[PDB]
Design a protein around this ligand. Structure first.
Ligand SMILES: Nc1nc2c(ncn2[C@@H]2O[C@H](COP(=O)(O)CP(=O)(O)OP(=O)(O)O)[C@@H](O)[C@H]2O)c(=O)[nH]1
Ligand SMILES: Nc1nc2c(ncn2[C@@H]2O[C@H](COP(=O)(O)OP(=O)(O)OP(=O)(O)O)[C@@H](O)[C@H]2O)c(=O)[nH]1
Ligand SMILES: Nc1ncnc2c1ncn2[C@@H]1O[C@H](COP(=O)(O)OP(=O)(O)NP(=O)(O)O)[C@@H](O)[C@H]1O
Ligand SMILES: [Mg+2]
Ligand SMILES: [Mg+2]
Ligand SMILES: [Mg+2]
Lengths: 308, 426
């Protein structure tokens, strides 16, 4: 019933610009599970990362269990979350010479795959851009934008999407960075892979498993082209986020027994398969320590308490 | 300022559009030639909302007429007000769609559509501040359902920030005119869900009931039925065309009546409606109008409002009226009929008043309700689709036009989801 959505907070370091403004530390960490926003409104989570937390620490204390669930045959999804300027792309993709959990994930995922492979794997990587509700194929951009299609037993496939059956960390890493070069953030960077495993004994009944691992560079809350992008982006951010609130009611097991509004957006409808599936989920809120961001840190965290 | 673009697609749609145009020209003092012969300066002040001004003191509807068959066009051109339309705005095919949504959406209507698109782009370029589009058609046939769907998809692609309004002729339960109606409706409804901002669900059965029971009319013709629809259409946009005391246009109405994106299917209504005999034995007053409008038997959709709850209702009043009286009456209806209104949206009623009444009447009213009872319409349709689809009945024709079974599966799923969502918010 529940989606087991753990909620962690990552505080990005104060920038030189914030220091030059003279902004002080609006975020005060009280515990690994609790922060206050300065006065001192409380927010409570499963884990909080401070300004010096590394990419490896984020992996180890927040998503490693999700990646593991996938290699073990489950679905899992990481939703980085917040207002524009929050810290999501850096946490997820980062830079090729300073990568995000995408790389930390590939390194751990593939060590586990190579070991387990002794069950043949097909690591079906895909990467899409959800922009104005259209889906860009970022691995094969010649197909431009795609739609979403329900399937026999109504999960969802991005129509005619290009997938790559990779074997290594570097293959997916380069594939993804290229995919980011093909992007517009004005869109939701939905990165996903099907960790498919078939009994090396192919002549035996192939009772395969299809684990699903997904991490999203959600377009942030924004306060004519850009106005529309903002509009569409913010609307989808409210739609997926309140589909999360519906999931909380479901997970709680309260009297609000209804159909969760995943159909409100293409973003959510696709995410549906993992949001309500046999899965583990994680939201990584991304916030700033600066007084300058208080509005942002205040709204991003308010949501995070509700999601949690 | 604030120009509306009118589109008519398929036979029924075209017919309704003709009626609409006739009424509106009369209202604005425009004759069958396009010349203004009215008295009031108020009739011309906002003439540009629906009419383009041509050379030599003439006015022409910002209307596009679409059909896969040419006969309908001819019929329109030969009918009353036929000559007012711009000849270049008639876009017709030669083949027809044969009650096949696939022919209208994928094949014939696809070949047709580019011309239509070109026309409508030009029409958009002409107007300075186009507020949006109004499409009149039916979801039970081929040409009317497919062509309209494709066109609305294209207009949401090129005009994603503009208001998209449809006036549809929903298939009734008992009076089933065709055999594949369930299929065509299902396919079109799905598309409407994603691409229209507001959809006025009009039903022939309900119209008949109105005509028979309320007007006491010996022999209704389609024209008579169409008249009612036309009146309703006129009502919604009265605020764009005239002054008033409280003014609400298409956008304002949508924002007040649509609390969740998908829930944009209205049950419209009109009042007053009396016979010739019962005209003398009545009070021309706001309380009476209010009484009429909220009655279940005055709804133009075949759904019982007493089977659900009103999420929101917009009332649009025309004529010289006291605001206080209007407010009292609307508060009274919500207090007395508490059980028919969702309790978690306080003041479920939005009011708008235009000083200029329709011709012949001193006071008039138009009703727009977002009722959870609309689920009944969807549910029946879904059921019928299931009944057909389980045995793959008539599927072959659709597949011969390039359509795949999976689309049907998708649409049905979508509709089911929609139904569920309505139920839960009840
Ligand atoms: N309320 C009205 N309903 C109508 C009218 N004419 C037809 N209809 C209804 O609409 C349905 C028939 O639709 P159409 O003739 O519009 C189908 P269309 O010409 O659009 O496509 P084809 O399949 O190519 O004929 C059916 O339910 C009729 O009973 C009308 O003047 N008023
Ligand atoms: N006292 C008084 N109140 C009015 C009058 N007209 C409208 N209202 C009130 O004003 C509110 C509605 O706001 P409006 O002023 O009509 O809306 P607006 O400022 O034009 O804003 P938009 O139309 O939404 O752009 C309601 O509370 C009405 O009761 C008036 O003549 N006198
Ligand atoms: N933990 C971090 N350490 C160092 N730099 C960071 C960190 N987090 C974010 N940044 C930087 O801040 C800029 C990134 O904003 P990110 O790209 O983090 O914003 P975003 O959340 O993707 N914004 P948006 O796309 O609008 O929702 C990047 O160039 C990062 O290098
Ligand atoms: Mg980003
Ligand atoms: Mg026809
Ligand atoms: Mg106003």
């Amino acid at each position: 019933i529940t989606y087991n959505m753990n909620v962690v907070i990552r505080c990005r370091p104060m920038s030189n610009s914030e220091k030059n403004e003279g902004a002080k530390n609006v975020i005060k960490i009280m515990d690994n599970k609790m922060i206050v926003l300065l006065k001192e409104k409380r927010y409570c989570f499963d884990y909080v990362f401070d300004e010096n937390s590394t990419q490896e620490d984020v992996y180890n204390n927040s998503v490693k269990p999700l990646v593991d669930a996938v290699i073990k045959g489950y679905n899992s999804t990481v939703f980085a979350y917040g207002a524009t300027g929050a810290g999501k792309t850096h946490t997820i993709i980062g830079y090729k010479n300073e990568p995000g959990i995408m790389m930390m994930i590939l390194q751990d995922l593939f060590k586990k795959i190579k070991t387990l492979k002794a069950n043949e794997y097909k690591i079906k990587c895909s990467f899409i851009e959800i922009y104005n509700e259209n889906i860009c194929d970022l691995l094969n951009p010649s197909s431009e934008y795609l739609d979403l299609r329900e399937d026999p037993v109504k999960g969802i496939t991005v129509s005619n999407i290009f997938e790559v059956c990779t074997t290594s960390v570097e293959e997916i890493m380069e594939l993804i960075h290229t995919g980011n070069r093909n992007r517009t953030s004005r869109s939701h960077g939905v990165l996903q892979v099907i960790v498919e495993e078939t009994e090396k004994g192919q002549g035996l009944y192939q009772q395969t498993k299809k684990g699903k691992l997904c991490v999203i560079d959600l377009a942030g809350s924004e306060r004519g082209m850009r106005m529309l992008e903002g509009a569409n982006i913010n609307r989808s951010l409210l739609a997926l986020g309140n589909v999360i609130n519906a999931l909380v009611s479901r997970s709680k097991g309260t009297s609000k027994s209804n159909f969760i509004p995943f159909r409100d957006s293409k973003l959510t409808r696709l995410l549906k398969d993992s949001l309500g599936g046999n899965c583990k989920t994680l939201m990584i809120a991304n916030i700033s320590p600066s007084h300058l961001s208080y509005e942002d840190t205040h709204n991003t965290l308010k949501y995070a308490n509700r999601a949690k | 300022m604030r120009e509306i673009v009118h589109i008519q697609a398929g036979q029924c749609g075209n017919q309704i559009g003709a009626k609409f145009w006739e009424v509106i020209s009369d209202e604005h003092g425009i004759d069958p030639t396009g010349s203004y012969h009215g008295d009031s300066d108020l009739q011309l002040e906002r003439i540009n909302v629906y009419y383009n001004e041509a050379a030599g003191n003439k006015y022409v509807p910002r209307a596009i007429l679409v059909d896969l068959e040419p006969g309908t066009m001819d019929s329109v051109r030969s009918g009353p007000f036929g000559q007012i339309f711009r000849p270049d705005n008639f876009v017709f095919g030669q083949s027809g769609a044969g009650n096949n949504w696939a022919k209208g959406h994928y094949t014939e209507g696809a070949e047709l559509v580019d011309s239509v698109l070109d026309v409508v782009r030009k029409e958009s370029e002409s107007c300075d501040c186009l507020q949006g589009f109004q499409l009149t058609h039916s979801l039970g046939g081929g040409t009317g359902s497919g062509m309209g769907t494709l066109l609305i998809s294209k207009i949401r692609e090129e005009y994603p920030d503009r208001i998209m309004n449809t006036f549809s002729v929903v298939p009734s339960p008992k009076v089933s005119d065709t055999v594949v109606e369930p299929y065509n409706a299902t396919l079109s409804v799905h598309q409407l869900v994603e691409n229209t901002d507001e959809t006025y669900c009009i039903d022939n059965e309900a119209l008949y009931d109105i005509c028979f029971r309320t007007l006491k009319l010996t022999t209704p013709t389609y024209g008579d039925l169409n008249h009612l629809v036309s009146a309703t259409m006129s009502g919604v946009t009265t605020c764009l065309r005239f002054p008033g005391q409280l003014n609400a246009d298409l956008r304002k109405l949508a924002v007040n009546m649509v609390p969740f994106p998908r829930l944009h299917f209205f049950m419209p209504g009109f009042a007053p409606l009396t016979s010739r005999g019962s005209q003398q034995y009545r009070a021309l007053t706001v309380p009476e109008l209010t009484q009429q409008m909220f009655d279940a038997k005055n709804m133009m959709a075949a759904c019982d409002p007493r089977h659900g709850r009103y999420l929101t209702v917009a009332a649009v009043f025309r004529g010289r009226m006291s605001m206080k009286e209007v407010d009292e009456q609307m508060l009274n209806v919500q207090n007395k009929n508490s059980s028919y209104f969702v309790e978690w949206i306080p003041n479920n009623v939005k009011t708008a008043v235009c000083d200029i009444p329709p011709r012949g009447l001193k006071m008039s009213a138009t009703f727009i309700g977002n009722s959870t009872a609309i689920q009944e319409l969807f549910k029946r349709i879904s059921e019928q689709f299931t009944a057909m689809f389980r045995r793959k009945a008539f599927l072959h024709w659709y597949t011969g036009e390039g359509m795949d079974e999976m689309e049907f599966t998708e649409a049905e799923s979508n509709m089911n989801d929609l139904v569920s969502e309505y139920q839960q918010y009840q």
